[PDB]
């Protein structure tokens, strides 16, 4: 499951759009995927890179940069074998996406609903009733 | 620049009424107007104008005269484009009237 750090990266000539000091002191994100070919893609941070046949690995500063590349590869090259990780400066690696092996738009058992409100949006509480009270406006 | 260029040389445009250069005198004011009118589109946002249009639509609904092409406030991009077009028209038009009345009178 865990990120094999030794995976070769896509060939790239470098750019100024990559990650900065906050990546090595706050968090960095990684994306891995399998390619059937040695083909050109566009980096979220800049110009063009070439993905190597087999397994690829990138490091990006934002999670959204990892997911923007993931949508681009899925539509352009029909690759869905992408895994997104969060990596902390302690060395600890956090698997992120897809979170339980199944993509979020496909249903899965054992997913518990978070954020679900039992009434429609117009049935919320007016601000005055919950003033100087800790009670939430969602009913 | 304020005194010896704009103020001193705007004498011919602002004193032009009743002459053949009174057209430049009118276009000077008209472009000053259009320029100011552009800032209504540049400083405002679409959501205010859509909610104002809702109350005007209500008054048309009351008299059974609502249109079948439902009125909308202009898009965010079109609001920017209308503001920029009227800004450019008013600023350039004011310079055009000032330059032409000044140099026709003195040159």
């Amino acid at each position: 499951e865990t990120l094999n750090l030794q995976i070769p990266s896509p060939t790239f000539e470098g750019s100024t759009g990559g990650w900065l000091r906050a990546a090595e002191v706050e968090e960095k994100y990684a994306i891995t995927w399998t390619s059937p070919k040695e083909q050109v893609f566009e980096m979220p941070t800049g110009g063009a890179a070439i993905m190597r046949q087999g397994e690829n690995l990138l490091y990006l500063a934002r999670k959204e940069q990892c997911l923007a590349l993931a949508t681009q590869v899925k539509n352009s090259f029909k690759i869905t074998d992408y895994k997104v990780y969060r990596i902390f400066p302690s060395g600890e690696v956090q698997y992120l996406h897809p979170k339980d092996g199944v993509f979020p738009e496909k249903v899965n058992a054992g997913r518990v609903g978070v954020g679900n409100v039992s009434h429609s949006i117009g049935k919320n509480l007016n601000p005055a009733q919950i003033k100087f009270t800790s009670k939430s406006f969602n009913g | 620049w304020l005194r010896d260029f704009l103020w001193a040389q705007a004498s011919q445009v602002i004193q032009s009424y009743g002459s053949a250069l009174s057209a430049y005198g009118l276009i000077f004011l008209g472009a000053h107007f259009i320029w100011a009118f552009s800032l209504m589109f540049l400083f405002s946002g679409r959501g205010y104008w859509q909610e104002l249009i809702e109350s005007i639509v209500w008054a048309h609904n009351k008299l059974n005269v609502a249109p079948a092409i439902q009125p909308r406030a202009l898009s965010i991009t079109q609001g920017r484009a209308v503001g920029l077009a009227h800004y450019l028209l008013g600023g350039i038009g004011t310079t055009w009237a000032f330059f032409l009345a000044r140099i026709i009178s003195v040159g």
């Binding site: 934002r62 609903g113 978070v114 949006i121 | -």
Partner: protein
């Protein structure tokens, strides 16, 4: 973080989940609608507040509602 709510008018069209750029939303099972599924927001710490989910939703007033709240490095979209 931002706070994202899903109200029970959700028809289970999955459009918000496909539109979300930061994997905040996912689909869970629910017998309330014809599609048998409702959106859920388990990962709101990653919500940047783009409101692309709200644009995607087709119910009359949005079943998904994003409430912009406290700002973080994640919700500010800062790569520095």
């Amino acid at each position: 973080s931002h706070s994202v709510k899903v109200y029970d008018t959700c028809i289970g069209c999955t459009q918000c989940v496909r539109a979300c750029p930061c994997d905040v939303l996912e689909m869970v099972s629910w017998d309330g609608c014809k599609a048998g599924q409702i959106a859920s927001a388990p990962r709101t710490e990653d919500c940047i507040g783009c409101k692309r989910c709200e644009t995607a939703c087709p119910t009359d007033f949005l079943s998904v509602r994003v409430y912009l709240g406290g700002e973080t490095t994640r919700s500010m979209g800062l790569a520095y």
